[PDB]
Amino acid sequence: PVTLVEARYKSFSIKMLKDMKEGVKQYGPNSPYMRTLLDSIAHGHRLIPYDWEILAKSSLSPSQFLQFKTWWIDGVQEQVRRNRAANPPVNIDADQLLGIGQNWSTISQQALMQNEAIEQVRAICLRAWEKIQDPGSACPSFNTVRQGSKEPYPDFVARLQDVAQKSIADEKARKVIVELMAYENANPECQSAIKPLKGKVPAGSDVISEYVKACDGIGG
């Protein structure tokens, strides 16, 4: 990252890259430990689009760098359409956020970027990292995730909370969908255990807290 009297760009150490690879390989790219570590890296530095490529290339499988680059390209193609419709329109084109082109293809040209382009490339890079799949799997639809027999209830809810995180982009639309689907796809035991509790949050609680509290020793 770059350090603010002029712009000086220094690569990462070996320890940071070793920790990132050892995290991604063992726990997954979207385990909560990796999200916490990645947000601590990104919010605590000044990342140019060179550094997202250096970080993601040296940490991900080659089957996952393709997905990272693809959803980065999709995110900047949608962010450009909201950038020209401004009043005044901002001078943030596609080739300034992708880190390629004629005027933006070397680290000396990129190190003189403003705060708004930094905070705009950060959100689309994080949303790109949020969509990277696990090595052997594909993202399923909501018709497939059902609590099978002999399976705990929070293990069932924590699959829905991830499926609704890869697909749907708005959090308010995530909450209503997972609150609805937590009752329809449940086992008959947890459905009968959860039916007298529906639509009743007592005080300062989440709905799914009382839901997982309700059916508790049911499966096993």
Cβ of residue 173: shortest distance to a second copy, in angstroms? Answer: 25
**Of residues 92, 147, 88, the one with CA closest to residue 116:** 92
* Amino acid letter, 42: A
How far, in Å, CA of 59 to CA of 16, rounded? Answer: 10
Cβ of residue 212: shortest distance to a second copy, in angstroms? Answer: 14
Q: How many residues does the chain have?
A: 220
Instruction: Out of 195, 201, 205, 206, point to the residue binding a second copy (CB under 8 A).
Output: 195
How far, in Å, CA of 169 to CA of 141, rounded? Answer: 15
88 versus 196: smaller Cβ distance to a second copy: 196
How far, in Å, CA of 65 to CA of 60, rounded? Answer: 6
Q: Are 214 and 194 contacting, i.e. CB atoms less than 8 angstroms apart?
A: yes
For residue 217, state whether it binds a second copy (rule: CB under 8 A): yes
For residue 199, state whether it binds a second copy (rule: CB under 8 A): no
Instruction: Out of 185, 193, 211, 212, point to the residue binding a second copy (CB under 8 A).
Output: 193
12 versus 183: smaller Cβ distance to a second copy: 183
Region 60-89 residues binding a second copy, contact defined as CB under 8 A: none
How far, in Å, CA of 191 to CA of 183, rounded? Answer: 7
The CA-based diameter of the chain, rounded to the nearest angstrom, is 67
Cβ of residue 159: shortest distance to a second copy, in angstroms? Answer: 24
What are the start-end ranges of the H helices in the chain? 14-26, 32-43, 49-57, 62-81, 94-97, 107-110, 115-129, 153-166, 171-184, 188-194, 207-214
Instruction: Out of 196, 202, 204, 220, point to the residue binding a second copy (CB under 8 A).
Output: 196
For residue 212, state whether it binds a second copy (rule: CB under 8 A): no
Cβ of residue 194: shortest distance to a second copy, in angstroms? Answer: 11
How far, in Å, CA of 166 to CA of 161, rounded? Answer: 9
Residues in contact with a second copy, counted by CB under 8 A, come to a total of: 6
95 versus 189: smaller Cβ distance to a second copy: 189
**Residues interacting with a second copy, by CB under 8 A?**
192-193, 195-196, 214, 217
